[model samples]
Target: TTLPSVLLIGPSGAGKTALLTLFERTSYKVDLDAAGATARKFLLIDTPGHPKLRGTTLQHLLNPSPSLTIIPYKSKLKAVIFLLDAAALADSDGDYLSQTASYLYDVLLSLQKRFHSRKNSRAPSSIPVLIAANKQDLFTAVPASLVKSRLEHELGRIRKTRQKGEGWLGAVGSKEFKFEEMMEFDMEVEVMGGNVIGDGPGAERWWRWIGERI
Candidate 1:
């Protein structure tokens, strides 16, 4: 397998930066907040959640940068990490999961479409996406399973519906859209047992579950 680049995306203040800082350290000391954070030296990219940049295809323009671009075993990425704010999801207003979830879905759909188009026109799409539901430490809210199930249900329905008709990339290839549906995404509850103790084991479990297609 070739090297793989890591992409972290999320709304504002969702610990994307902090996680990158933590991941920089190849060491397994889970509690190390600031003990010689070693830069993994592969390539880490952080996307801003600016209102103006919303719904843009920033990933497309990120291919030929001056970083260590690890193009997975298949000359692509292994995953795209999308960070979500757990605190905001349990809110009563604009912070409600309804609004946040809708926006997230739209962004993800657009990203998938854009990736497909690029792949059709010039290259192949690389990497599946992983949604990182962060900030679990700040909530006394609903169960994580409920949130994840809801998202999976929504996405699964969308894929089925789109599969029946011409997709957003209708012009590319009729059968290409039918190549494979998006995987049933698993949720990585930011910390532990839905808390904030930084559960590396829990995260690994989620990762293994996600990567296992069979």
Candidate 2:
């Protein structure tokens, strides 16, 4: 198939599972934990939250043996979605929820190193990562516009810094940025099913920004 598989990654209670469940019908899935569930093609793998402090636990969850392999990645993954809570964006509880962005960035960096170590096409490498910035509906003073901008900016900065310092600072050099240019996009604004903006404006705009670089 020309289409790519999508991988959902994020902190616990970040809504990764919920987003996957909601979008199950729209794409192929590879559910990671389905309770004795057999492998299914095109299905999304909802992996449990990888431990931050415990490197061993994270490795086990990410690089498990065949018997423990929950997500059957088909060829290259289509994309990676990070479902982060917006409330965490402006948290003052010293939770360092902002670190969530940094955490995910490092995960991908390690994954890339692992894939390149073998230099095998069979190994997964290079997939677009999308940030949901969920809980946009709850923002009051922050405003959705500001929140979305900050989300994109902060996430981008976090990713860039992880790769190196800033622009072309790493041995490989800085990576270019991409995103959807459209003004309005669809995202389902209400709790029930409903259009957020319109056709695919917002999503398209964001994707346009990330499309080429990915």
Candidate 3:
């Protein structure tokens, strides 16, 4: 059941698969508690990184194909988590920047379009995104704060390149793009840095953020 689902989107070597594996295998899980009417659990649906690009992510969610974002048939969706390896992004090369931002560019646009794609002026619900800046244990990893700015800058680049101008993301044509811009669409984009296995704050911090959302 992609019921109460939270889509897990990440580039290769991002530890998303390892995340699902590492978390639940221990004692922790994506599932949340009701300490304060309810305990709620969500499916952290993992979509592979590939040419599926925009088509697979959207089609799988929209079409409701039967493991597989079996997303498992609409309205079950609650939120999204974009897990990325901060170490790779902080590398000397620009490839990770392109890779991360390129995939993210499509994901955000899909959300923007999703809101606009609504049947009428009204929307079904709000779906926010969390940029889980993982792999902070590495000395090479970028801090969560810097990741925001760097990712913001790179996203604008891809947005302009794809749309032939800065008009696509909209409202930020004159300036750099920030996750804040998505607010107009009722979308909240958050970036939280942590690690999966190494050291640092570990997954607990990331898990707490998820607890607050759903």
Q: Which candidate is the best by lDDT?
A: 3
Clashing pairs in 1: none
TM-score of each: 0.55, 0.50, 0.81
RMSD of each: 8.5, 9.4, 5.4
Tell me the tens digit of each residue's lDDT in model 2 across 84-170: 665566676625446674565454444444444444456543444455556544432233355455544554666576546412211
- The C-alpha stretches of model 3 lying farther than 4 A from their native spots are 1-3, 26-40, 60-75, 163-167, 170-174
The order of the candidates by TM-score, greatest first, is 3, 1, 2
Rank list by lDDT: 3, 1, 2
**Clashes per candidate (backbone, < 3 Å):** 0, 22, 0
Per-residue CA lDDT of model 1 for 1-214, tens digit only, reads 2233445566666666676654544111122222322223233445566545554434432342212232212223334566666656666564455544544555555445544454335643344555666655554544556556655555445555666762332223333222133421121222122322353223444344334421
Model 2 ranges with Cα > 4 A deviation: 1-4, 25-41, 50-76, 111-125, 140-214
Poorest lDDT segment (10 consecutive residues) of candidate 1: 184-193
Candidate 2's error at 145, in angstroms? 7.1
Task: Mark the 10 consecutive residues where model 3 has the least summed lDDT.
Answer: 63-72
Higher TM-score: candidate 1 or 2? 1
- Model 3: per-residue Cα lDDT over 142-210, one tens digit each: 999999999999988877676673227635453678899898878889999988888787877766677
Candidate 1 wrong stretches, greater than 4 Å: 1-3, 26-42, 55-76, 114-123, 139-142, 152-214
